[PDB]
Amino acid sequence: MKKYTCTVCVYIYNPEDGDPDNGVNPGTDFKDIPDDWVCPLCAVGKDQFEEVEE
Ligand SMILES: [Fe+3]
């Protein structure tokens, strides 16, 4: 699983942490996050994220 970075703020989604306060368990792939999830810092949608290539 890849990290996905917000394109408009510094937030980085890390699958290992998930986003449990917003319902996303640890170990959740970015593609499986619910469609209405948003960036916890700037509130934009998943369509504004990019894969962090390795
Ligand atoms: Fe953001």
UniProtKB/Swiss-Prot annotation:
Cofactor remark: Binds 1 Fe(3+) ion per subunit.
A molecular-function term among this protein's GO annotations: electron transfer activity
Sequence positions bearing N-formylmethionine: M1
A Pfam family annotated for this UniProt entry: Rubredoxin
Signal peptide coordinates: none
Keywords from the UniProt entry: Electron transport, Formylation, Iron, Metal-binding, Transport
Domain Rubredoxin-like: 1-54
Superkingdom classification of source: Bacteria
Binding site for Fe cation: C6, C9, C39, C42
Disulfide topology: none
SUPFAM superfamilies: Rubredoxin-like
Cofactors, names only: Fe(3+)
Coiled coil ranges: none
UniProt cross-references to InterPro entries, sorted A to Z: Rubredoxin (IPR024922), Rubredoxin-like_dom (IPR024934), Rubredoxin_dom (IPR024935), Rubredoxin_ET (IPR050526), Rubredoxin_Fe_BS (IPR018527)
Example GO biological process: alkane catabolic process
Record's function text: Rubredoxin is a small nonheme, iron protein lacking acid-labile sulfide. Its single Fe, chelated to 4 Cys, functions as an electron acceptor and may also stabilize the conformation of the molecule.
Family, per entry: Belongs to the rubredoxin family.
Protein name as it appears in the record: Rubredoxin
